[PDB]
C-alpha cells in the first residue's frame, strides 16, 4: 500500500486553511454576505472567479465557496428571520442575483453604520431602500427600459368595477390608482409588452425585513401569507390582469408610473 495511505489518510491542508482563514475574517446572516463579498473583492481576477455565493439547488440555503469547496452556509428562513416551515416561491437566477446584491447592501449598512440600531429597524431598511444603487438594480431587472427618474404620467380613467376587483390582488385587496402598480414589472420585446410581479421574496426583503435574533417570526411570517398570496392570485389570473394592464401601459405613454393629482406612489422602490 505504502503511499496510498500516505496519500489518502493525509488531512486536507488546503481545506482547513481556506476553510477557516474565514473564521479569522469573522473576528450575522447579512454580515457574512457582506464580508464574503468584501473578501472576494480583495483578490483581482484569475482569483476573484474562485469565490462564489450561490443558493443551494433547493433555494433553502445560501452557500459560500472558495474553489470548489463550501466554506460556510446560510439558511434563508433564518436569514429573513422567518420560521422553518415557511414556504418560498422559487426565483429565476436574475431574481436570485438581485436578492444577493440587496443582502450585501444590508451588510454594508449594518457593519458601516451600527448606529441605525437607534429607534427604527426601519431606518436600516429605509437606508437600503433609499440607496440609488439598489434602486438602479431593481429597476434594471424589473423595468429594464424605464428611467426611474422620469416625470410621472397622469391617469386616463378606463376602469370598470369588475376591473378594479381583478386588480385588487396587486395591492393586498385594495384598489388605489396612485399605488396599484408598485409591484409590477414590465419588458418590451419585439413591440409586445410583458408584465410580471416583483418576486415576493424580494418584495419582503425590500419592505418588511427586520433584524432580530427577539422572536418576531410567526408574525413576520404571516406577511409571507400576504405576499405569496398576492403573487399567487396574480399568477392564478395573470392573462386577464395583463390585458387590463396592457391597456393602461399603452394609454399612458408606455408606463404604469401613474400619478393622480400630485399623488404618485407607483414606483418600484
Curated annotation (Swiss-Prot):
Q: What Pfam families does the record tag this protein with?
A: SopD
UniProt-annotated location(s)? Secreted; Host cell membrane
Q: What do we know about what induces or represses this protein's expression?
A: Transcription is induced inside host cells and is dependent on the SsrA/SsrB and PhoP/PhoQ two-component systems. Highly expressed in host macrophages and when grown in an acidic environment.
Q: What does this protein do?
A: Effector proteins function to alter host cell physiology and promote bacterial survival in host tissues. Contributes to the formation of Salmonella-induced filaments (Sifs) in infected epithelial cells and to replication in macrophages.
Phenotype on disruption:
Mutation leads to a prolonged survival of infected mice. Deletion blocks Sifs formation at an intermediate stage, before fusion of late endosome compartments with the SCV, and impairs bacterial replication in mouse macrophages but not in human epithelial cells.
Query: Which InterPro entries does the annotation name?
Result: SopD
Protein's GO biological process: protein secretion by the type III secretion system
Positions occupied by motif Required to target late endocytic compartments: 2-9
Q: What is the lineage of its organism?
A: Bacteria, Pseudomonadati, Pseudomonadota, Gammaproteobacteria, Enterobacterales
Please tell me the species this chain comes from.
Salmonella typhimurium (strain LT2 / SGSC1412 / ATCC 700720)
Q: What GO CC annotations are associated with the protein?
A: extracellular region; host cell membrane; host cell plasma membrane; membrane
Q: Which gene encodes it?
A: sopD2
Give the protein family: Belongs to the SopD family.
Domain note for this entry? Answer: The N-terminal domain mediates secretion by SPI-2 T3SS and targeting of late endocytic compartments in host cells.
Name of the protein in its database record = Secreted effector protein sopD2
Top-level lineage group? Bacteria
Q: What is its main location?
A: secreted
Tell me the keywords, alphabetical order. Answer: Host cell membrane, Host membrane, Membrane, Secreted, Virulence
